[PDB]
């Protein structure tokens, strides 16, 4: 039986079913450590702790943000027995988990997350620092839950990647590892998380209105600040280098997964 440590996002705690689901399995003979996060940096600590135990999987119990905190710490482990990632959709939206088709049924999800066949997948990383496993969307702000932003105005940027170059004013920039952002509409409907490419969609104005591209990297510059929402995390600035970390971690994913080549 493979050991697991589950990292619960502080919000999604209270959930009698999950508690009872963890009991059932623990006595069926599975080790499932649990750890609850209170804030940024907690994820990494409990990942480190998972490594101590030599656990098989670390399971992100959360929405996209918790999945990133766990992933980012995963993909910055030194060494040899890095745990895989497993996912339990416990955010308020779970765009990433829905789109890889993590089971809605709570017990089956655990079952996948603990026993599933792990498969190497890509992470995206911004300015050799912040990471994201799903979607980056960018705007000139300061629309709605459409991307944690409120005033959206078109403004100059220049963007480049392998045999890709573009310059103009733009309203939204979606660079995806996955298909669907917050809410759950396809910004990059053909993304795969194992092709080693980011998908780029530039929304011009307010088909010539959308420019598209696919590259293992994109540089973005703008004279005024761009506001990127990276799987919930905000990042502002005039220079972004977004690069794929190909095959950076192993995820327990269901067999048919829609986002695998």
């Amino acid at each position: 039986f493979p050991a697991s440590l589950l990292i619960l996002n502080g919000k999604s705690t209270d959930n009698l079913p999950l508690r009872e689901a963890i009991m059932l399995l623990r006595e069926e003979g599975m080790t499932i450590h649990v750890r609850v996060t209170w804030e940024k940096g907690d994820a990494a600590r409990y990942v480190e702790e998972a490594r101590k135990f030599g656990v098989a999987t670390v399971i992100a119990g959360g929405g996209d943000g918790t999945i990133n905190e766990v992933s980012t710490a995963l993909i910055q482990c030194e060494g040899d027995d890095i745990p895989a990632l497993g996912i339990l959709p416990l955010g308020t939206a779970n765009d990433f988990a829905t789109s890889v088709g993590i089971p809605e049924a709570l017990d089956k999800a655990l079952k996948l997350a603990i026993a599933g066949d792990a498969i190497a997948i890509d992470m995206a990383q911004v300015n050799k620092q912040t990471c994201f496993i799903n979607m980056a969307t960018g705007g000139f702000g300061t629309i709605h839950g459409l991307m944690r932003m409120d005033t959206l105005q078109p403004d100059r940027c220049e963007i480049r990647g392998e045999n890709f170059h573009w310059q103009g004013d733009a309203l939204v920039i979606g660079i995806g590892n996955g298909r669907q952002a917050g809410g759950g509409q396809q910004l990059c409907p053909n993304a795969l998380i194992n092709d080693g490419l980011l998908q780029l969609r530039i929304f011009t104005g307010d088909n010539p209105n959308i420019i598209e591209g696919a590259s293992s990297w994109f540089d973005i510059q703008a004279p005024h600040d761009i506001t990127f929402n990276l799987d919930g995390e905000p990042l502002s600035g005039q220079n972004f280098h977004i690069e794929i970390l190909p095959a950076a971690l192993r995820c327990r994913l269901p067999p048919d997964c829609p986002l695998l080549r």
Side-chain angles (χ1 to χ4, degrees):
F1 265 137
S4 306
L5 174 151
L6 164 71
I7 298 179
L8 273 176
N9 180 54
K11 292 167 61 145
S12 40
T13 49
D14 26 53
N15 188 315
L16 229 89
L18 171 67
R19 199 176 282 276
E20 301 176 308
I22 293 161
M23 304 296 74
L24 258 45
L25 288 68
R26 220 107 86 121
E27 59 169 67
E28 184 186 331
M30 283 166 287
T31 293
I32 312 164
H33 307 288
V34 166
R35 294 300 112 106
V36 173
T37 57
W38 190 66
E39 87 196 298
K40 221 118 309 294
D42 279 348
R45 195 178 61 251
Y46 294 139
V47 162
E48 204 29 69
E49 191 182 12
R51 290 262 286 161
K52 257 169 93 289
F53 296 145
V55 129
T57 310
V58 185
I59 301 180
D64 314 311
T66 302
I67 301 159
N68 286 338
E69 308 186 3
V70 187
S71 292
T72 291
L74 283 186
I75 72 89
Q76 33 226 207
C77 288
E78 328 304 2
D80 224 353
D81 277 312
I82 291 76
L85 164 61
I87 286 161
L88 292 200
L90 298 178
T92 22
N94 296 269
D95 311 280
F96 181 76
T98 294
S99 48
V100 296
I102 301 292
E104 315 283 312
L106 194 238
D107 29 305
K108 307 278 189 61
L110 262 169
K111 180 120 74 190
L112 192 44
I114 294 132
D117 289 333
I119 174 130
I121 68 167
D122 296 338
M123 290 279 283
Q125 175 184 45
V126 178
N127 298 329
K128 272 83 156 79
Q129 269 203 316
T130 295
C131 283
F132 70 103
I133 219 203
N134 192 39
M135 187 71 70
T137 51
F140 293 90
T142 18
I143 313 170
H144 278 316
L146 289 85
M147 53 166 293
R148 308 257 40 63
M149 271 215 31
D150 349 53
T151 160
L152 220 42
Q153 53 209 182
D155 207 19
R156 193 131 91 214
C157 51
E158 183 158 71
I159 291 163
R160 349 173 63 136
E162 261 165 302
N163 315 313
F164 184 98
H165 175 91
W166 177 93
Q167 198 200 132
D169 313 343
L171 207 67
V172 182
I173 297 152
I175 295 154
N177 203 33
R179 264 168 196 17
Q180 79 182 78
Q185 44 275 203
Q186 317 301 262
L187 275 95
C188 326
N190 52 191
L192 302 156
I193 57 174
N194 68 341
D195 55 1
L197 312 176
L198 301 148
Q199 296 301 123
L200 175 73
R201 293 267 286 245
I202 303 155
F203 298 92
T204 273
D206 296 281
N207 184 182
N209 263 7
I210 296 162
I211 300 94
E212 303 192 335
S215 168
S216 97
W217 59 282
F218 285 103
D219 286 336
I220 304 132
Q221 43 162 60
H224 308 124
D225 277 6
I226 310 185
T227 320
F228 269 110
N229 165 90
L230 309 184
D231 284 338
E233 226 69 354
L235 203 49
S236 269
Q238 307 169 203
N239 275 79
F240 310 84
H241 170 88
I242 296 159
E243 207 188 71
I244 256 167
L245 299 184
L249 75 176
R250 305 171 51 238
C251 194
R252 306 208 181 281
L253 285 182
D256 267 295
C257 187
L259 312 195
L260 298 181
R261 203 206 295 280

mmCIF file of all heavy atoms in Angstrom, residues 86-113:
data_model
loop_
_atom_site.group_PDB
_atom_site.id
_atom_site.type_symbol
_atom_site.label_atom_id
_atom_site.label_comp_id
_atom_site.label_asym_id
_atom_site.label_seq_id
_atom_site.Cartn_x
_atom_site.Cartn_y
_atom_site.Cartn_z
ATOM 1 N N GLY A 86 -1.364 14.433 -6.496
ATOM 2 C CA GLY A 86 -2.692 13.879 -6.659
ATOM 3 C C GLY A 86 -3.627 15.027 -6.351
ATOM 4 O O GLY A 86 -3.230 15.990 -5.679
ATOM 5 N N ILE A 87 -4.860 14.973 -6.824
ATOM 6 C CA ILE A 87 -5.696 16.156 -6.757
ATOM 7 C C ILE A 87 -7.046 15.849 -6.149
ATOM 8 O O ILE A 87 -7.674 14.841 -6.509
ATOM 9 C CB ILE A 87 -5.928 16.755 -8.158
ATOM 10 C CG1 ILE A 87 -4.670 17.472 -8.660
ATOM 11 C CG2 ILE A 87 -7.073 17.747 -8.147
ATOM 12 C CD1 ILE A 87 -4.657 17.672 -10.141
ATOM 13 N N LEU A 88 -7.489 16.704 -5.225
ATOM 14 C CA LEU A 88 -8.855 16.625 -4.751
ATOM 15 C C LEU A 88 -9.465 17.986 -4.932
ATOM 16 O O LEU A 88 -9.022 18.965 -4.303
ATOM 17 C CB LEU A 88 -8.932 16.304 -3.264
ATOM 18 C CG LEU A 88 -8.516 14.980 -2.706
ATOM 19 C CD1 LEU A 88 -9.194 14.893 -1.348
ATOM 20 C CD2 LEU A 88 -8.984 13.833 -3.643
ATOM 21 N N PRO A 89 -10.509 18.043 -5.758
ATOM 22 C CA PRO A 89 -11.187 19.277 -6.143
ATOM 23 C C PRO A 89 -11.965 19.836 -4.965
ATOM 24 O O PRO A 89 -13.077 19.392 -4.675
ATOM 25 C CB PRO A 89 -12.110 18.843 -7.290
ATOM 26 C CG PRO A 89 -12.213 17.375 -7.187
ATOM 27 C CD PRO A 89 -11.100 16.835 -6.358
ATOM 28 N N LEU A 90 -11.368 20.779 -4.256
ATOM 29 C CA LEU A 90 -12.010 21.326 -3.073
ATOM 30 C C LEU A 90 -12.016 22.854 -3.092
ATOM 31 O O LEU A 90 -12.399 23.503 -2.099
ATOM 32 C CB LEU A 90 -11.277 20.841 -1.852
ATOM 33 C CG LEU A 90 -11.293 19.326 -1.650
ATOM 34 C CD1 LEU A 90 -10.462 18.942 -0.374
ATOM 35 C CD2 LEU A 90 -12.733 18.785 -1.599
ATOM 36 N N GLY A 91 -11.560 23.438 -4.198
ATOM 37 C CA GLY A 91 -11.679 24.865 -4.363
ATOM 38 C C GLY A 91 -13.126 25.297 -4.530
ATOM 39 O O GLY A 91 -14.051 24.487 -4.339
ATOM 40 N N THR A 92 -13.338 26.581 -4.835
ATOM 41 C CA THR A 92 -14.705 27.013 -5.100
ATOM 42 C C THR A 92 -14.904 26.844 -6.587
ATOM 43 O O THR A 92 -15.934 26.302 -7.002
ATOM 44 C CB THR A 92 -15.161 28.378 -4.452
ATOM 45 O OG1 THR A 92 -14.015 29.192 -4.151
ATOM 46 C CG2 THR A 92 -16.041 28.106 -3.119
ATOM 47 N N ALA A 93 -13.903 27.213 -7.386
ATOM 48 C CA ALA A 93 -13.793 26.624 -8.723
ATOM 49 C C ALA A 93 -12.488 25.769 -8.852
ATOM 50 O O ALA A 93 -11.393 26.074 -8.246
ATOM 51 C CB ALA A 93 -13.922 27.678 -9.832
ATOM 52 N N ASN A 94 -12.637 24.692 -9.621
ATOM 53 C CA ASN A 94 -11.576 23.766 -9.789
ATOM 54 C C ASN A 94 -11.371 23.551 -11.250
ATOM 55 O O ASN A 94 -11.308 22.400 -11.712
ATOM 56 C CB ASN A 94 -11.950 22.457 -9.146
ATOM 57 C CG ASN A 94 -12.113 22.580 -7.657
ATOM 58 O OD1 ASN A 94 -11.147 22.386 -6.883
ATOM 59 N ND2 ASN A 94 -13.327 22.910 -7.236
ATOM 60 N N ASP A 95 -11.268 24.656 -11.989
ATOM 61 C CA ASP A 95 -11.070 24.591 -13.432
ATOM 62 C C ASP A 95 -10.044 23.519 -13.818
ATOM 63 O O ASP A 95 -10.308 22.648 -14.671
ATOM 64 C CB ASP A 95 -10.669 25.953 -14.000
ATOM 65 C CG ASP A 95 -11.563 27.052 -13.529
ATOM 66 O OD1 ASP A 95 -12.685 27.205 -14.085
ATOM 67 O OD2 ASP A 95 -11.136 27.753 -12.579
ATOM 68 N N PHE A 96 -8.882 23.542 -13.192
ATOM 69 C CA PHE A 96 -7.880 22.617 -13.655
ATOM 70 C C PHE A 96 -8.337 21.193 -13.459
ATOM 71 O O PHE A 96 -8.185 20.373 -14.357
ATOM 72 C CB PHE A 96 -6.536 22.820 -13.004
ATOM 73 C CG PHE A 96 -5.529 21.886 -13.492
ATOM 74 C CD1 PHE A 96 -4.950 22.066 -14.759
ATOM 75 C CD2 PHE A 96 -5.160 20.786 -12.726
ATOM 76 C CE1 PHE A 96 -3.961 21.181 -15.250
ATOM 77 C CE2 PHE A 96 -4.186 19.871 -13.197
ATOM 78 C CZ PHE A 96 -3.592 20.083 -14.472
ATOM 79 N N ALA A 97 -8.919 20.903 -12.304
ATOM 80 C CA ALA A 97 -9.303 19.531 -11.997
ATOM 81 C C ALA A 97 -10.486 19.049 -12.853
ATOM 82 O O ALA A 97 -10.520 17.922 -13.322
ATOM 83 C CB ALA A 97 -9.618 19.418 -10.545
ATOM 84 N N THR A 98 -11.467 19.908 -13.053
ATOM 85 C CA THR A 98 -12.568 19.590 -13.933
ATOM 86 C C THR A 98 -12.027 19.208 -15.309
ATOM 87 O O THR A 98 -12.458 18.229 -15.884
ATOM 88 C CB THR A 98 -13.489 20.804 -14.058
ATOM 89 O OG1 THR A 98 -14.093 21.030 -12.781
ATOM 90 C CG2 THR A 98 -14.558 20.654 -15.215
ATOM 91 N N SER A 99 -11.066 19.969 -15.824
ATOM 92 C CA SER A 99 -10.653 19.806 -17.221
ATOM 93 C C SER A 99 -9.737 18.606 -17.447
ATOM 94 O O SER A 99 -9.527 18.210 -18.590
ATOM 95 C CB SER A 99 -9.969 21.076 -17.713
ATOM 96 O OG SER A 99 -9.026 21.439 -16.732
ATOM 97 N N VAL A 100 -9.166 18.045 -16.391
ATOM 98 C CA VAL A 100 -8.375 16.845 -16.562
ATOM 99 C C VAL A 100 -9.274 15.699 -16.202
ATOM 100 O O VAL A 100 -8.864 14.541 -16.164
ATOM 101 C CB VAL A 100 -7.079 16.844 -15.731
ATOM 102 C CG1 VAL A 100 -6.175 17.966 -16.203
ATOM 103 C CG2 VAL A 100 -7.384 17.017 -14.269
ATOM 104 N N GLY A 101 -10.522 16.067 -15.935
ATOM 105 C CA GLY A 101 -11.567 15.134 -15.524
ATOM 106 C C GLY A 101 -11.298 14.374 -14.237
ATOM 107 O O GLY A 101 -11.518 13.173 -14.217
ATOM 108 N N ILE A 102 -10.794 15.040 -13.184
ATOM 109 C CA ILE A 102 -10.779 14.455 -11.839
ATOM 110 C C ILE A 102 -12.232 14.161 -11.437
ATOM 111 O O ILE A 102 -13.114 15.017 -11.628
ATOM 112 C CB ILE A 102 -10.154 15.406 -10.779
ATOM 113 C CG1 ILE A 102 -8.722 15.766 -11.150
ATOM 114 C CG2 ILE A 102 -10.186 14.772 -9.385
ATOM 115 C CD1 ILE A 102 -7.779 14.645 -11.067
ATOM 116 N N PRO A 103 -12.496 12.940 -10.915
ATOM 117 C CA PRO A 103 -13.831 12.514 -10.519
ATOM 118 C C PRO A 103 -14.511 13.482 -9.596
ATOM 119 O O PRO A 103 -13.863 14.010 -8.656
ATOM 120 C CB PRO A 103 -13.563 11.196 -9.821
ATOM 121 C CG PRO A 103 -12.436 10.652 -10.570
ATOM 122 C CD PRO A 103 -11.539 11.830 -10.751
ATOM 123 N N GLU A 104 -15.796 13.735 -9.911
ATOM 124 C CA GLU A 104 -16.691 14.580 -9.091
ATOM 125 C C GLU A 104 -16.988 13.819 -7.785
ATOM 126 O O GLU A 104 -16.752 14.350 -6.688
ATOM 127 C CB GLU A 104 -17.980 14.996 -9.836
ATOM 128 C CG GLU A 104 -17.795 15.503 -11.327
ATOM 129 C CD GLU A 104 -17.249 16.996 -11.510
ATOM 130 O OE1 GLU A 104 -17.774 17.942 -10.861
ATOM 131 O OE2 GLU A 104 -16.324 17.226 -12.347
ATOM 132 N N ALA A 105 -17.459 12.569 -7.920
ATOM 133 C CA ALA A 105 -17.532 11.582 -6.804
ATOM 134 C C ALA A 105 -16.287 11.604 -5.897
ATOM 135 O O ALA A 105 -15.203 11.177 -6.310
ATOM 136 C CB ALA A 105 -17.783 10.133 -7.362
ATOM 137 N N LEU A 106 -16.465 12.101 -4.672
ATOM 138 C CA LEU A 106 -15.381 12.293 -3.679
ATOM 139 C C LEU A 106 -14.484 11.089 -3.337
ATOM 140 O O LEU A 106 -13.319 11.257 -3.056
ATOM 141 C CB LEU A 106 -15.991 12.792 -2.377
ATOM 142 C CG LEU A 106 -15.180 13.393 -1.208
ATOM 143 C CD1 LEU A 106 -15.390 12.592 0.128
ATOM 144 C CD2 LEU A 106 -13.721 13.601 -1.517
ATOM 145 N N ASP A 107 -15.035 9.882 -3.321
ATOM 146 C CA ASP A 107 -14.268 8.668 -2.954
ATOM 147 C C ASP A 107 -13.347 8.221 -4.105
ATOM 148 O O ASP A 107 -12.160 7.906 -3.880
ATOM 149 C CB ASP A 107 -15.202 7.536 -2.467
ATOM 150 C CG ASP A 107 -16.605 7.606 -3.098
ATOM 151 O OD1 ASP A 107 -17.268 8.662 -2.989
ATOM 152 O OD2 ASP A 107 -17.061 6.609 -3.708
ATOM 153 N N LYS A 108 -13.907 8.219 -5.325
ATOM 154 C CA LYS A 108 -13.179 7.912 -6.573
ATOM 155 C C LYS A 108 -11.986 8.864 -6.817
ATOM 156 O O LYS A 108 -10.933 8.458 -7.303
ATOM 157 C CB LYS A 108 -14.147 7.977 -7.764
ATOM 158 C CG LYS A 108 -15.443 7.108 -7.632
ATOM 159 C CD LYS A 108 -15.214 5.607 -7.998
ATOM 160 C CE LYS A 108 -16.539 4.851 -8.076
ATOM 161 N NZ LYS A 108 -17.430 5.425 -9.135
ATOM 162 N N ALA A 109 -12.171 10.123 -6.444
ATOM 163 C CA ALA A 109 -11.149 11.106 -6.556
ATOM 164 C C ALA A 109 -9.982 10.769 -5.669
ATOM 165 O O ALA A 109 -8.824 10.759 -6.104
ATOM 166 C CB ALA A 109 -11.689 12.407 -6.202
ATOM 167 N N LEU A 110 -10.275 10.482 -4.415
ATOM 168 C CA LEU A 110 -9.249 10.016 -3.503
ATOM 169 C C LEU A 110 -8.553 8.808 -4.077
ATOM 170 O O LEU A 110 -7.320 8.677 -3.987
ATOM 171 C CB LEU A 110 -9.886 9.585 -2.203
ATOM 172 C CG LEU A 110 -9.875 10.577 -1.061
ATOM 173 C CD1 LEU A 110 -10.807 10.007 -0.003
ATOM 174 C CD2 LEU A 110 -8.428 10.828 -0.512
ATOM 175 N N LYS A 111 -9.361 7.920 -4.649
ATOM 176 C CA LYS A 111 -8.865 6.642 -5.150
ATOM 177 C C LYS A 111 -7.837 6.924 -6.260
ATOM 178 O O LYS A 111 -6.702 6.457 -6.160
ATOM 179 C CB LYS A 111 -10.059 5.742 -5.592
ATOM 180 C CG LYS A 111 -9.789 4.290 -6.188
ATOM 181 C CD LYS A 111 -10.462 3.143 -5.339
ATOM 182 C CE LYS A 111 -12.013 3.043 -5.514
ATOM 183 N NZ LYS A 111 -12.585 2.099 -4.498
ATOM 184 N N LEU A 112 -8.234 7.699 -7.285
ATOM 185 C CA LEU A 112 -7.302 8.286 -8.293
ATOM 186 C C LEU A 112 -6.062 8.939 -7.638
ATOM 187 O O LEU A 112 -4.889 8.559 -7.911
ATOM 188 C CB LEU A 112 -8.017 9.331 -9.152
ATOM 189 C CG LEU A 112 -7.234 9.774 -10.381
ATOM 190 C CD1 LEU A 112 -6.614 8.594 -11.102
ATOM 191 C CD2 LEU A 112 -8.093 10.578 -11.353
ATOM 192 N N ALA A 113 -6.305 9.893 -6.752
ATOM 193 C CA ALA A 113 -5.198 10.603 -6.191
ATOM 194 C C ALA A 113 -4.171 9.746 -5.467
ATOM 195 O O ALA A 113 -2.978 10.098 -5.468
ATOM 196 C CB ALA A 113 -5.688 11.705 -5.284
#
